Amino acid sequence: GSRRYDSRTTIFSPEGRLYQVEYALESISHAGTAIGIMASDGIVLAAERKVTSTLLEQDTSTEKLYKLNDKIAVAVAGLTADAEILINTARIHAQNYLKTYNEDIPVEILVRRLSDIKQGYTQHGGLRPFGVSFIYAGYDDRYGYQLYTSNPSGNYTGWKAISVGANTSAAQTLLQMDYKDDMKVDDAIELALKTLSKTTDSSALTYDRLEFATIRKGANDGEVYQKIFKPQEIKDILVKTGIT
Amino acid sequence: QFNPYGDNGGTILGIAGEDFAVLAGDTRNITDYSINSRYEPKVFDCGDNIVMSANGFAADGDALVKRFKNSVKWYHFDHNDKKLSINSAARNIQHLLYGKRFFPYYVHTIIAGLDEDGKGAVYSFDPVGSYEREQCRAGGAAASLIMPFLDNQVNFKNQYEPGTNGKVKKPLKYLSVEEVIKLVRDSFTSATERHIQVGDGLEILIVTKDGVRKEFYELKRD
Amino acid sequence: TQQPIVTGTSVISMKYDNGVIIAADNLGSYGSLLRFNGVERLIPVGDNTVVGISGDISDMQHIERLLKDLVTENAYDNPLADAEEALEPSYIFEYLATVMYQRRSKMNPLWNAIIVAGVQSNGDQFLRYVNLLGVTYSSPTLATGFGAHMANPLLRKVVDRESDIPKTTVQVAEEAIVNAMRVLYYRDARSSRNFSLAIIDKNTGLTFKKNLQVENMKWDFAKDIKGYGTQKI
Amino acid sequence: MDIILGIRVQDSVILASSKAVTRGISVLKDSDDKTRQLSPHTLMSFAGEAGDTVQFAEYIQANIQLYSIREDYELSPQAVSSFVRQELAKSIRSRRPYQVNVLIGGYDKKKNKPELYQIDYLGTKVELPYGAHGYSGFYTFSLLDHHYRPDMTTEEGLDLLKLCVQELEKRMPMDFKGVIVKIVDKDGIRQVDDF
Amino acid sequence: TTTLAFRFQGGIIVAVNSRATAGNWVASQTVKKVIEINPFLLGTMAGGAADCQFWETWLGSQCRLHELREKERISVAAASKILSNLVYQYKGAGLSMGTMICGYTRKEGPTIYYVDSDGTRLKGDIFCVGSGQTFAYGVLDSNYKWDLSVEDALYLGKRSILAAAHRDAYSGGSVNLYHVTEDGWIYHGNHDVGELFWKVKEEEGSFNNVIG
Amino acid sequence: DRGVSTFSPEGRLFQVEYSLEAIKLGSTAIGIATKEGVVLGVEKRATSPLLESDSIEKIVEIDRHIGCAMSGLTADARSMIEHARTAAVTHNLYYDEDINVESLTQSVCDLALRFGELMSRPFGVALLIAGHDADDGYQLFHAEPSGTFYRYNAKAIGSGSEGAQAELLNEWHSSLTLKEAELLVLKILKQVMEEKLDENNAQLSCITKQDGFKIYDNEKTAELIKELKEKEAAE
Amino acid sequence: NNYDGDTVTFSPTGRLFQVEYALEAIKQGSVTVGLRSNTHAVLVALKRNADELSSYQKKIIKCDEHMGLSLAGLAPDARVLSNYLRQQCNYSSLVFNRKLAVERAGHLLCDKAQKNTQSYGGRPYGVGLLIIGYDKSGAHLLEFQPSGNVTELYGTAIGARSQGAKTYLERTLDTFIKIDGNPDELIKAGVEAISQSLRDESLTVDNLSIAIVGKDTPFTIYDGEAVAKYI
Amino acid sequence: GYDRALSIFSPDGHIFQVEYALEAVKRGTCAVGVKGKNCVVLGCERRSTLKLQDTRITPSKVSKIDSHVVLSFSGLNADSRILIEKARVEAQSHRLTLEDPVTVEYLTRYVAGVQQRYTQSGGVRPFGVSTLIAGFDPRDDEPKLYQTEPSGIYSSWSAQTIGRNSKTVREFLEKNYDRKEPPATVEECVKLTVRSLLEVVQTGAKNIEITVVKPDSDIVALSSEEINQYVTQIEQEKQE
Ligand SMILES: *[C@@](C)(CO)[C@](*)(O)[C@H](CC(C)C)NC(=O)[C@H](Cc1ccccc1)NC(=O)[C@H](CC(C)C)NC(=O)[C@H](CCc1ccccc1)NC(=O)CN1CCOCC1
Ligand SMILES: [Mg+2]
Secondary structure: OHHHHOOOOOOEOOOOOEHHHHHHHHHHOOOOOEEEEEEOOEEEEEEEOOOOOOOOOOOOOOOOEEEOOOOEEEEEEEOHHHHHHHHHHHHHHHHHHHHHHOOOOOHHHHHHHHHHHHHHHHHEOOOOOOOEEEEEEEEEOOOEEEEEEEOOOOOEEEEOEEEEOOOHHHHHHHHHHHOOOOOOHHHHHHHHHHHHHHHOOOOOOOHHHEEEEEEEOOOOOOOOEEEEOOHHHHHHHHHHOOOO | OOOOOOOOOOEEEEEEOOOOEEEEEEOOEEEOOEEEEOOOOOOEEOOOOOEEEEEEOHHHHHHHHHHHHHHHHHHHHHOOOOOOOHHHHHHHHHHHHHOOOOOOOOEEEEEEEEOOOOOEEEEEEOOOOOEEEEOEEEEEOOHHHHHHHHHHHOOOOOOEOOOOOOOOEOOOOOOOHHHHHHHHHHHHHHHHHHOOOOOOEEEEEEEEOOEEEEEEEEOOOO | OOOOOEEEOOEEEEEOOOEEEEEEEOOEEEOOEEEEOOOOOEEEOOOOEEEEEEEEHHHHHHHHHHHHHHHHHHHOOOOOOOOOOOOOHHHHHHHHHHHHHHHHHOOOOOOEEEEEEEEOOOOOEEEEEEEOOOOEEEOOEEEOOHHHHHHHHHHOOOOOOHHHOOOOOHHHHHHHHHHHHHHHHHHOOOOOOEEEEEEEEOOOEEEEEEEEEOOOOOOHHHHHOOOOOOOOO | OOOEEEEEOOOEEEEEEEOOEEEOOEEEEOOOOOEEEEEOOEEEEEEEOOOHHHHHHHHHHHHHHHHHHHHOOOOOHHHHHHHHHHHHHHHOOOOOOOOEEEEEEEEEOOOOEEEEEEEOOOOOEEEOOEEEEHHHHHHHHHHHHHHOOOOOOHHHHHHHHHHHHHHHHHHOOOOOOOEEEEEEEOOEEEEEOOO | OEEEEEEEOOEEEEEEOOOEEEOOEEEEOOOOOEEEEEOOEEEEOOEOHHHHHHHHHHHHHHHHHHHHHHOOOOOHHHHHHHHHHHHHHOOOOOOOEEEEEEEEEOOOEEEEEEEEOOOOEEEOOEEEEEOOHHHHHHHHHHHOOOOOOHHHHHHHHHHHHHHHHHHOOOOOOEEEEEEEEOOEEEEEEEEEHHHHHHHHHHHHOOOOOOOO | OOOOOOEOOOOOEHHHHHHHHHHHHOOOEEEEEOOOOEEEEEEOOOOOOOEOHHHOOOEEEEEOOEEEEEEEOHHHHHHHHHHHHHHHHHHHHHHOOOOOHHHHHHHHHHHHOOEOOOEOOOOOEEEEEEEEEOOOEEEEEEEOOOOOEEEEOEEEEOOOHHHHHHHHHHHOOOOOOHHHHHHHHHHHHHHHOOOOOOOOOEEEEEEEOOOEEEEOOHHHHHHHHHHHHHHHHOO | OOOOOOOOOOOOOOOOHHHHHHHHHHHHOOOEEEEEOOOEEEEEEEOOEOOOOEOEOOOEEEEEOOEEEEEEEOHHHHHHHHHHHHHHHHHHHHHHOOOOOHHHHHHHHHHHHHHHHHOOOOOOOOEEEEEEEEEOOEEEEEEEOOOOOEEEOOEEEEOOOHHHHHHHHHHHHHHHOOOOOOHHHHHHHHHHHHHHHOOOOOOOOOOEEEEEEEOOEEEEEEOHHHHHHHO | OOOOOOOOEOOOOOEHHHHHHHHHHHHOOOEEEEEOOOOEEEEEEOOOOOOOEOOOOOOOOOEEOOOOEEEEEEEOHHHHHHHHHHHHHHHHHHHHHHOOOOOHHHHHHHHHHHHHHOOOOOOEOOOOEEEEEEEOOOOOOOOEEEEEOOOOOEEEEOEEEEOOOHHHHHHHHHHHOOOOOOOOOHHHHHHHHHHHHHOOOOOOOOOEEEEEEEOOOEEEEOOHHHHHHHHHHHHHHHOO
């Protein structure tokens, strides 16, 4: 019968590893680097677009950074199509929570549920896992500013600063070197860009090959604002830090 | 509107002795004011020395008996031809009846036989499965006529010892199969006189350790 | 839940010494309208059974088809289909009785009253009734509808009990059936003069008589009846 | 099930619930507690159809307790009330709806404010200074309109509550066998044993 | 029916009558309205005979499965709740049951739970259930004290059923007594009302309404 | 790979045959049937000394009149026991009587072959089902994952089964008393066990008509072990 | 080789190897013999044990008052098929008030076994059955094979060394067929037939298993001291 | 639905998928459970290759199933969440129907049953997780400590460890833990748990998590400084 053609996606190796999860992580390691840095007064999300073409429409484009709700955003690393499936689910989950409790969903709860979906694809169903790693950046009134990451295994962890995708080894060393706890958003913005600039496989880091976003309490009095940076705004912030 | 139930009349009677038990029932089958059959048996030998009758709506009675007979058959298959005791049959019938709690079998069911000590046993059921072991039970159309007579003659109710100032009751004792059949025949002739759905014939099934014997008697046909 | 539309009235039958007789008129009523006049309500199954059906005619035609299919199914992988493993009246009846009771238990009955008349392989007479409720009974005489009220009393004068069956000949039995059909024509408003009659004998087999008529009727005394009490003219 | 009252004062929420359980012409019990603790600072009283009331209350209780364990965190009274309302809003269009009316009294630890919610079996939620279900309202609302002040203490609230119970005991046809009073505040939930 | 069960100093008394009716027709005078579930558990039966008889024997099967799985006797609370959750699933279907789950366990002590077909489940010290419950309450309440002796308690339970058996038309037959202690339940006999009434009338000097 | 319900060229189900190899790796369980009762005994085999041996539950009650010992992948037995207990209680509910030991075993064995591509594989555990009923008296059954069950006078299953079975062949006779059977299980267990037999690493049980199924205390078994050693030294 | 992974695969020569391997399970099974006359039909079965401490595996199963079979191979598969026969016999009784013909019994078993040989996932039954019965056309004996093939015979035998008993019955055909109105003599012929399949072992009291059905004889099984007569 | 039998027997009688699930447990961070006279302590390793972590929000290794029971684990982290969720739901379901919280044995038996179901259900692989379940039964002061594993077997332990280098720490506990006299106090039990982890961990900074459970739903997690005091005390006594 059909048994002959089954790859058996949800099984262990002799060493106790999930083949497909490991190979999905290998896939993600070739994706454009994405960095998240959490400051005391906000969060930074920075991501490198995958080898841009000059004729690509840059301003009306969304590849790396997506909005889940008013308080939570994600940086993507891996298959974009896979990520969008998960993002729409995460968006719906946030609205279900709001409908039920009349309160915005706590960040971890959203992260856990999305990570539980990924876990399901590794344990049952016989389907390939989602070749996606997320960096969640969000705020709630319990823990304040939070950074998480999830990967195809469905395992998630919290971070002060973290990188996903390509050159995470090199990127994480640089973040570990220059990061400190009393850091501000504006300093974190500079760190994010400097790290990408050194770890990038491109010749030079330019505005058209980047996506950028911040989550500050920079709005008027005790409320959070999401800023997805425009091309011109990235061009300015790149000059302001002295990279170009 | 379609009414799935009907009343086929008739009446049945079960009496238990010391080492025997009888289950009697008239053979008349009716609908409204018409006679369908003057001889349509409704007391059956179901095997393992158990006799059974489900009086009321005949279609439901036949279905129930048919199902219990089949239950006995499968009890043998599944439990190495073990004999189904009368108490085990009773409980099994409760589950058959209660299984249709929300669309009941419109029947009064009575079974008779011998218990595991060899003593006479009669069990009576309501339409939805409540059952009780008794020495004596009448069921069906003329049950209200027959039953108080049985209380008086079988269980000696309201009978006191002469001269004792109504202080000493008449002592209980088992009846002989001969005395019991007299009570059965007199009960049914009395019921035939005063109840229009009762008559034509009387069929009695007697159960002893030797087996199941039958006896038939004519009843008035008006 | 149904309501019968086109209906068939009484089916009458009785046992005699060597077999059974069964009869039913050829009418398909539509309420008070005597709509259809060529309706056969006696259906032979093999050469040893006749099923007489009263009530809803659409449900009767359904049963015809079931019986017809039963014969076909029994012949499958059955070298003895026309011998030892042929359909018996008791097999045909129990099948119908199972269906009728299953249908009433689903609250969607076949709105009929059926009499299965036949002769078993061992020569025994078979005559049993079943209706829309799944109720079954057997008797030396069986009748449906008005036949139960008017025919049974007449037929029971001939065969009042089991012991009268061997004493009753086919001539006497048929005479009683034909007489009963006349009485039903006098008194049943949804009856017709034309009827069919079937005899299943253990020796002569199945004899199916069609296009019979009620005859030798008494109507002459009607001319003397004037008014409703006092009127003399 | 008949009388359930609720009064939100300055620093606490007070719930009063009748003790009588009547079936037919017999008062089967006169010490029934018509309330469940949903969380350390949230209390729900209930009234309505027999069986449904307790079944619903305990179902909600289990769900809130499950949440508390999962997140190691207490849900706000507002969040709990919204959850309860949605369950009743689902219920009303079910094959067999829960015929249960509830009051949810809670103390929000983040806001440091008492909160009283009234939710009927249709899923109609309202936040109130004082609330009641059933025929109780027809007497108590007008009484509280008159005597209630928003800055009252817990002790003043209890005296105000005594005034309601007295009026009900005077004019109500049925004998409801007094009330169990419970207070919800910053220190959690406690019962007044002598009322 | 009339059934009762009350809690007292020396444990639990349980008393029931034995009549069964189908309208005004007295169908039986020898019905067991107490179901022995286990050595420490009892169940009273009022309302639909079949419903009570069927589901309370089913309850005993569930209580047996519990002690097999958990290696421990089921609590009265858990036992009563299995039955109450069961009837609640059938709510609206037309079950008629008014039961009382009586028993003793170490953690609970003597405990009585009232459970009915419309889902009600109540813990309490005194309950009377059935068509003659009011007549039983009248006698029971007026003579009840916690400090009753085992002898006096048994009599009160018996006398309360007799009171109902007398006045209520659908109550009668005979009285079945039970006493539940820390050691388990103890049967205290079947008492025919036919003899018991006159015996009580003579000895107690009550029932003056009746022609002696 | 290959189908789960596949026949080998020799005419056996691969998976059933492989599950039998798993049972050979399991701890020893011995059952002996007498006219005074049936005795069931097992090797606990704690994987480490820190493990509390009393929590090792390899002897199990199914009903008051039926007991059960296991060997192999013991985790697989839980649903088998659950089914057996339900079957036993359900039959009592339907028929107001105790259920025959054979009928109980048959009910358990019906689960065995309900696997394929129902559960995904056969059970990796063998069961010794011991009990009593009015018809056939004291009985001992060996229920395999093949769906087959044999009645036995005595039976050993597990790692030391072939050695113990040969020993049971010589020692068993039809007039064994209960006390003699108890000692015989202990004796044979001590022979095939790796570690030295004591009350903590071995467990006894029995089923009698009078007292029903009973698992013995460690105090009671310890005395039987001491009684056993003295009797062997006595000749 | 490459074509025996499942039942859904044909070999290049047109063979179903899984069905053949199921057939092999019957050859390993203990011998059982079937034979009939015109009045009676008899099953004789050599029961097998695990060891001296074990019981002897029951080979014969009753299906109705007038029908039953003996098994050889996987016993659980016989239990499934016999249970199916019991239901079909029972369906025929309840619905048609008719005893199920032994020929139809065979046709029903054939069709049930066949479905398992044409579908993926399932497996063939690993048991051979000898069905005997007495119906409206007299005594019958059927041989069921899990390939689906059912065959009506005067006599036969299946299991290990069944060729010896089968040769004997082929010689004795003219004799035993006319054993009418004599149960004990027909059994004797069957017991002598199964004896031709014995090696080193002989027929003992708890080893032999006999069953019979006939004109005025319901299907009944004889074990233990009841078969001591025929040794 | 996906039906494939993934967990199946091999010729030698092994279910490789269950055994490979144990290898995943062996890869996981070390977890230790030690029960004293009036308490149970659950110690857990946290690997120090992960700096820049946010310990406030990062899922803790020890999880509360109810107010009186806790569950730690070793192996696949994602898999553990599914077992913990099921256990928490069952804990509330038990309180609802039995009107009493679960015993530690019952909760362990449930979790173990779930793990077993995944070893012979079609279309699923076994949980790559072994758990240590600890707590106190309702109205009981006897400490309980259970272990489960992918196969579905469970058992009670006086002290036990699971995860990577668990054989080393088990060796330590086997000679250092006395059955006749367990850790009489909370301090003694915590110290022994920390000592045992110090055989394997590396540094006693933010690598060791300790959670103490006491009777009547008294559970508390120790902070860094509190744990560090034990580490400092043990090392000074070691130099001898
Ligand atoms: C006191 C004695 C009276 O209320 C108690 O409450 C007892 C409880 C004891 C017996 C367990 N209750 C009854 O006796 C109870 C009253 C009752 C009647 C009908 C419905 C609900 C409650 N009686 C019964 O349950 C009787 C028991 C008989 C005597 C064995 N059963 C019936 O009345 C049956 C079945 C009733 C039923 C319930 C639900 C669905 C369908 C049916 N009905 C009949 O027997 C009908 N009828 C009787 C006359 O013969 C023709 C058919
Ligand atoms: Mg009359």
